[PDB]
């Protein structure tokens, strides 16, 4: 993750202001609404028939918090994403059977959410740092696939 010091502090600075709970639920909900086929993995979560059903679904909100908690923990180890995410990788591949492309779609959806919450504060340079971070994270979760 060729992330420069300037890129690194920018990511971290912003991350400080994030409410991980509401952001993870927002991101996962949108993932499910914008790219409807990513619902195939969450049939046990209940009603996902309309936007409000998805965004308001408590299990979606609870799972999003779970996803973001791991992402944060990843932001604390930017120089070693692969190690940090290795077990999550094996899991998503061997047990859950999730096509890694889903990790890239979530990343972009997360960037839209951050953009949505911070407006002007989400400058183009800060967006550029985050794009590198979400690819790195996507790549780390993909790494142990076989």
């Amino acid at each position: 993750v060729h992330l420069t010091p300037e890129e690194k502090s920018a990511v971290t600075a912003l991350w400080g202001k994030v409410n991980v709970d509401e952001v993870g639920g927002e991101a996962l909900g949108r993932l499910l609404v914008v790219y409807p086929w990513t619902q195939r993995f969450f049939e046990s979560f209940g009603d996902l028939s309309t936007p409000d059903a998805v965004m308001g679904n408590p299990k979606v909100k609870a799972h999003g918090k779970k996803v973001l908690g791991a992402f944060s923990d990843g932001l604390a180890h930017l120089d070693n994403l692969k190690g940090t995410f290795a077990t999550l990788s094996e899991l998503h591949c061997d047990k859950l059977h999730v096509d890694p492309e889903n990790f890239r779609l979530l990343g972009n959806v997360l960037v839209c959410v951050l953009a949505h919450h911070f407006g002007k504060e989400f400058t183009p340079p800060v967006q550029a740092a985050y794009q590198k971070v979400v690819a790195g994270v996507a790549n780390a979760l993909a790494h142990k696939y076989h």
Partner: protein
């Protein structure tokens, strides 16, 4: 395909963009140039520095084209006909780049339209831009 609801959402979101469109296009372009540097190879003749005139000027042209496509949402292949020939025969931009610009346009709108960028609207806009991208790319071969 775009549904009635999608069409409705797009007209509403772009409707609120109004007289900022051009600036949103320049910003969209700037976001693309920094987040995806490879896209710059199509613009070696441009001054790409922040605030550049050519950017602001090209930004406006892009926005005008999206305004026209929304103005002709039920006849986009014909309304964009010219733009399509240009990108396929003269410019010959690789198809993947269209996803990059589209993503940067959503980010730009997300940042500027807090109340209107609802999930349902985000979805519709994403489909819409994917539909534009497909038209501009339909005559490549």
């Amino acid at each position: 395909v775009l549904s009635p609801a999608d069409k409705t959402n797009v007209k509403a979101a772009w409707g609120k963009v109004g007289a900022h469109a051009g600036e949103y296009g320049a910003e969209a372009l700037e976001r693309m140039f920094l987040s995806f540097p490879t896209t710059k190879t199509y613009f070696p003749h441009f001054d790409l520095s922040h605030g550049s005139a050519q950017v602001k000027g090209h930004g406006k042209k892009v926005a005008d084209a999206l305004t026209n496509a929304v103005a002709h949402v039920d006849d986009m292949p014909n309304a964009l006909s010219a733009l399509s020939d240009l990108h396929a025969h003269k410019l010959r931009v690789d198809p993947v780049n269209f996803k990059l610009l589209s993503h940067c346009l959503l980010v730009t709108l997300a940042a500027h339209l807090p109340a209107e960028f609802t999930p349902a609207v985000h979805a519709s806009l994403d489909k819409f831009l994917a539909s534009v991208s497909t038209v501009l790319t339909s005559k490549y071969r």
